[PDB]
Amino acid sequence: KTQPYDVYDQVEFDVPIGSRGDCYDRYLCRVEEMRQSIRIISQCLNKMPPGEI
Amino acid sequence: XXXXXXXXXXXXXXXXXXXXXXXXXXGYSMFAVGIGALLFGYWSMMKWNRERRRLQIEDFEARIALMPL
């Protein structure tokens, strides 16, 4: 969200942040990353301008 | 004509959907079947032990009846 690399902020991102610094909540956010990652891949399929490689 | 990779989304695969939900068991209803099986369990078992008593006294009666033994 802070530093764009190649066409960012235009794609909708969801970042999971917990509360406790234990191993379980540090695992839950990784699965929550995985469920909120297809949103980016679907938006990548939605926006594809044909041109140079 | 230029042919490149085409874009397709259609249904968008549904971005983050919950699949985990409460099924079968509710809470209080499981205790009615749980403790209910226990009360049915003892009542069925103890009636057989009363039927065992019919055999028990009759088994020991054979020893009393047999004196030539």
From Swiss-Prot, chain A:
Location within or outside the cell: Mitochondrion inner membrane
Disulfide links within the chain: none
Residues where [4Fe-4S] cluster binds: C23, C29, C44
Oligomeric and partner information: Core subunit of respiratory chain NADH dehydrogenase (Complex I) which is composed of 45 different subunits. Component of the iron-sulfur (IP) fragment of the enzyme. Interacts with NDUFAF3. Interacts with NDUFAF7. Interacts with CERS2.
Family: Belongs to the complex I 49 kDa subunit family.
Function field: Core subunit of the mitochondrial membrane respiratory chain NADH dehydrogenase (Complex I) which catalyzes electron transfer from NADH through the respiratory chain, using ubiquinone as an electron acceptor. Essential for the catalytic activity and assembly of complex I. Redox-sensitive, critical component of the oxygen-sensing pathway in the pulmonary vasculature which plays a key role in acute pulmonary oxygen-sensing and hypoxic pulmonary vasoconstriction. Plays an important role in carotid body sensing of hypoxia.
Protein name as annotated: NADH dehydrogenase [ubiquinone] iron-sulfur protein 2, mitochondrial
Originating species: Bos taurus (Bovine)
UniProtKB/Swiss-Prot annotation, chain B:
Superkingdom of the organism of origin: Eukaryota
Residue ranges of the TM segments: 27-46
Cellular compartment(s): Mitochondrion inner membrane; Nucleus
Complex and partners: Complex I is composed of 45 different subunits. Interacts with CARD15, but not with CARD4. Interacts with STAT3, but not with STAT1, STAT2 and STAT5A. Interacts with OLFM4.
Family: Belongs to the complex I NDUFA13 subunit family.
Function: Accessory subunit of the mitochondrial membrane respiratory chain NADH dehydrogenase (Complex I), that is believed not to be involved in catalysis. Complex I functions in the transfer of electrons from NADH to the respiratory chain. The immediate electron acceptor for the enzyme is believed to be ubiquinone. Involved in the interferon/all-trans-retinoic acid (IFN/RA) induced cell death. This apoptotic activity is inhibited by interaction with viral IRF1. Prevents the transactivation of STAT3 target genes.
Protein name (database record): NADH dehydrogenase [ubiquinone] 1 alpha subcomplex subunit 13
Upper taxonomic lineage: Eukaryota, Metazoa, Chordata, Craniata, Vertebrata
Gene responsible for this protein: NDUFA13
